[PDB]
């Protein structure tokens, strides 16, 4: 009834705070998980670019 | 050989810390070699053709199957070239003199065809003057911009 609903609503407020801490926990994982993915992609294209510049200076000196 | 090739690959002079101005002249390399086998010569040639140094380096190769007395001429060949290119065209020459133990055995051989009285362990009495006349053809000159920097290599026998 309404009385059990108010009680399970207090417990649902605890549960909602529990989902909010779990959701911000998953977010605090995956924001920087996405950003380490992009940091990998950045450093990878930069290492390839270094190899490209070495290739061009070597071919033109040959 | 890897440390000498690494030095000659990346040895640069810093004008950021001295106020000279950039104007950056890289190194001519006079690479003299006396009784290298093939296994070290292929290393140095692959290293130089990779890092783009065979367009600034003059190579004096005396392999270990060439006859064992023209090692007496080879450091003098390399240093005459270095003295020219440094002190009359303003280069900044780096001379790699590979494995002077082979040179010193190359003149123990000659100095014991003449029964010349030796120093210790058979090497002749005058060898200090020959190593002196090789090594002391280096250094800078007052009034000029050239230089000769020597990295000789030694292979100490019982280290
Ligand atoms: N026939 C030879 N072949 C090779 N070396 C020699 C011969 N004769 C002498 N020598 C070496 O050269 C030196 C020659 O000295 P010496 O004949 O006394 O005066 P000079 O210095 O005018 O020749 C000796 O110390 C010897 O070791």
Curated annotation (Swiss-Prot), chain A:
Disulfide bonds: none annotated. It comes from the Bacteria. Coiled coil: none annotated. Produces ATP from ADP in the presence of a proton gradient across the membrane. Belongs to the V-ATPase E subunit family. This is V-type ATP synthase subunit E. It comes from Thermus thermophilus (strain ATCC 27634 / DSM 579 / HB8). The gene is atpE. The chain holds residues 2 to 63 of 188 of the full protein.
UniProtKB/Swiss-Prot annotation, chain B:
The gene is atpB. It comes from the Bacteria. The chain holds residues 161 to 319 of 478 of the full protein. It comes from Thermus thermophilus (strain ATCC 27634 / DSM 579 / HB8). This is V-type ATP synthase beta chain. Coiled coil: none annotated. Produces ATP from ADP in the presence of a proton gradient across the membrane. The V-type beta chain is a regulatory subunit. Belongs to the ATPase alpha/beta chains family.
């Amino acid at each position: 009834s309404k009385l059990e609903a108010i009680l399970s609503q207090e417990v649902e407020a605890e549960i909602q705070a529990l989902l909010q801490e779990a959701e911000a926990k998953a977010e605090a994982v995956k924001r920087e998980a996405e950003e380490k993915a992009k940091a990998l992609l950045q450093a990878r294209e930069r290492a390839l670019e270094a190899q490209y510049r070495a290739a061009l200076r070597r071919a033109e000196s040959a | 050989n890897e440390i000498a090739a690494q030095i000659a690959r990346q040895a640069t002079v810093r004008p950021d810390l001295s106020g000279e101005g950039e104007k950056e002249e890289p190194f001519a390399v006079v690479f003299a070699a006396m009784g290298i086998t093939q296994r070290e010569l292929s290393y140095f040639i692959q290293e130089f053709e990779r890092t783009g140094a065979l367009s600034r380096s003059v190579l004096f190769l005396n392999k270990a199957d060439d006859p064992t007395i023209e090692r007496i001429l080879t450091p003098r060949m390399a240093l005459t070239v270095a003295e020219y290119l440094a002190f009359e065209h303003d280069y900044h020459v780096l001379v790699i003199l590979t494995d002077m133990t082979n040179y010193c055995e190359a003149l123990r051989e000659i100095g014991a065809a003449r029964e010349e009285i030796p120093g210790r362990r058979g090497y002749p009495g005058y060898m200090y003057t020959d190593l002196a006349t090789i090594y002391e053809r280096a250094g800078v000159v007052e009034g000029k911009k050239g230089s000769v920097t020597q990295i000789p290599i030694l292979s100490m026998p019982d280290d």
